[PDB]
Amino acid sequence: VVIEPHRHAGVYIARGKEDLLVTKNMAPGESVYGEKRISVEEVPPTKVEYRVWNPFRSKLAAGIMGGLDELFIAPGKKVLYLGAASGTSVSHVSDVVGPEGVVYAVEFSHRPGRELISMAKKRPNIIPIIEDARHPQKYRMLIGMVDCVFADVAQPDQARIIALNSHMFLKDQGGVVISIKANCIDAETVFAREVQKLREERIKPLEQLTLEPYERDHCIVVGRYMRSGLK
Amino acid sequence: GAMAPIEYLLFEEPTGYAVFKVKLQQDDIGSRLKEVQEQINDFGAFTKLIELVSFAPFKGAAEALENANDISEGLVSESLKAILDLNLPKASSKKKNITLAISDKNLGPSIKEEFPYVDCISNELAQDLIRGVRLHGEKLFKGQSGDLERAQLGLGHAYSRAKVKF
């Protein structure tokens, strides 16, 4: 197996029988949710373990496969992840940002939240926050200023959730990366309206990609936060 | 009453409470908000706008978690009462009220109940100044990269474990 760097720092391609999207495991030997681990050799040769990132199982991976130009998630970045669920996608964001970054992982539901806490115990760059993202004042003591807000919330009022969290925690010129599942909010009309709500919260849309063929009627949107207002 | 300038600012660190004095001159601040917002992003320029009065560290992890819980619910702990009691000037016959920037409007009524002469402010300028403290972090405090983040890690686990009954 040969490892090739992806365009996006902290993301890689494992070239073998199949070409797979992978991240470098921050907790070697540990799989988070049954994903395959691949060890690559490179005095005994040194081994580096990567984890397969399946775009059918992660909205962010699906976006990366579609060719997002700007990810805003990279080594050393601080990322506020809304909708962290049991931590599957968050584990890969943790791999990407590495030891110099941080993932603030917000999830409201306790069944997945308990699994999020458990997996975070093995990754010191994850801060698990079991709270309602509609009320970011409640966890402001737990979060600094972040470089990116990622949201996979699938709520009808997710636009307000994203806005409130961005105004509290997102650096000026920081990024917003949002998955929009039209059904949980025609699709093209919904997408346009949600993107407009972002504009009304000082977020300038940069790119909008479908998640086909990985997902139906989903759209990932990347934007830039303009604290002083759209120019 | 009418819009009064922000005089002080409260910031809740994972490690303790901080009271800052707001030095920004706020004549017609609306016409200058964009320029102020740009100053806040640069540490050097931000030092013109605010200055630390007091940082009061929590005694340990148990008190930090008690305060994370109180703050999450808009409550004034004994530690928050103390730092406000000791570091906000007291009302006098020559200066009747004091304005305090806070980010959580729901904490305001709890503060005023303990300090009726304090008017809490949570408008856009207050939020911008609080973002600035959040942004520049340890550089504002005598006694490092990671200190606050390390404290957030332990406090976030503690907060979340208490919620899910771990």
- Per DSSP, A203 falls in state E
Residues on chain B touching A171 (C-beta within 8 angstroms): 41, 135
Ordered structural domains, chain A, with CATH:
2-52 (3.30.200.20), 59-225 (3.40.50.150)
**CA A128/CA A132 separation, integer angstroms:** 12
Strand A47-52, strand A19-24: pairing: antiparallel
d(CA B48, CA B33): 15
Exp. method: X-ray
Alpha-carbon distance A187 to A8, whole Å? 29
- Cβ–Cβ gap A130/B148 under 8 Å: no
Instruction: List chain B residues with CB under 8 Å of A104.
Output: 156
What is the extent of the structural domain holding B92? 8-164
Q: Is A220 helix (H, G, I), strand (E, B) or coil?
A: strand
Contact A172 B37 (CB under 8 A): yes
Q: Which residues of B touch A229 (CB under 8 A)?
A: 34
| Domain count across chain B | 1
Let me know if residue B154 belongs to a domain: yes
Instruction: State how far the Cα of A98 lies from the Cα of A77, in Å rounded to an integer.
Output: 8
Q: Give the Cα separation of A141 and B149 in Å (integer).
A: 11
B-facing residues of A in 135-154 (CB < 8 A) are 137-145
Please check whether residue B27 lies inside any domain of the structure.
Answer: yes
* Contact call for B164 and A117, based on CB within 8 A: yes
Tokens 């997408």 belong to A191
- Tokens 């474990």, residue? B161
Q: Which of A127, A137, A139 minimises the CB distance to B153?
A: A127
Whether B3 maps to a domain, the answer reads no
Q: Is residue A97 a contact partner of residue A23, using CB atoms and an 8 Å limit?
A: no
DSSP calls for chain B: ---PPP-EEEEEETTEEEEEEE----TTGGGGHHHHHHHHTSHHHHTTTEEEEEEEE-SSHHHHHHHHHHHHTT---HHHHHHHHHHSPPP-SS---EEEE-S-GGGHHHHHHH-TTEEEE-SHHHHHHHHHHHHHGGGGS---TTHHHHHHHHHHHHHHHHHHT-
How many helices (H) and strands (E) are present in chain A, helices listed first? 5, 12
H/E segment holding residue A163: helix A158-169
Nearest residue, CB atoms, A128 vs list B67, B106, B156? B156
Best of B9, B32, B135, B160 to disrupt the A interface (most A CBs within 10 Å) is B160
User: What is the structure's resolution, reported in angstroms to one decimal?
Assistant: 1.7
β B8-13/B98-101 pair status: parallel
Q: What string of DSSP letters covers B54-80?
A: EEEE-SSHHHHHHHHHHHHTT---HHH
Residues of A in contact with B159 (CB under 8 A): 129-131, 139, 142
Q: Say how far apart CA B6 and CA B162 lie, in whole Å.
A: 36
Q: Contact at 8 Å (CB) between B20 and B50?
A: yes
Q: Residue B94 belongs to a domain with what CATH number?
A: 3.30.420.220
Q: How many residues does chain B have?
A: 166
Residues of A within 8 A of B14 (CB-CB) are 141-142
Secondary structure of A51-70 in the HEC alphabet?
Answer: EECCCCCCHHHHHHHHCCCC
State how far Cα B138 lies from the chain centre: 14
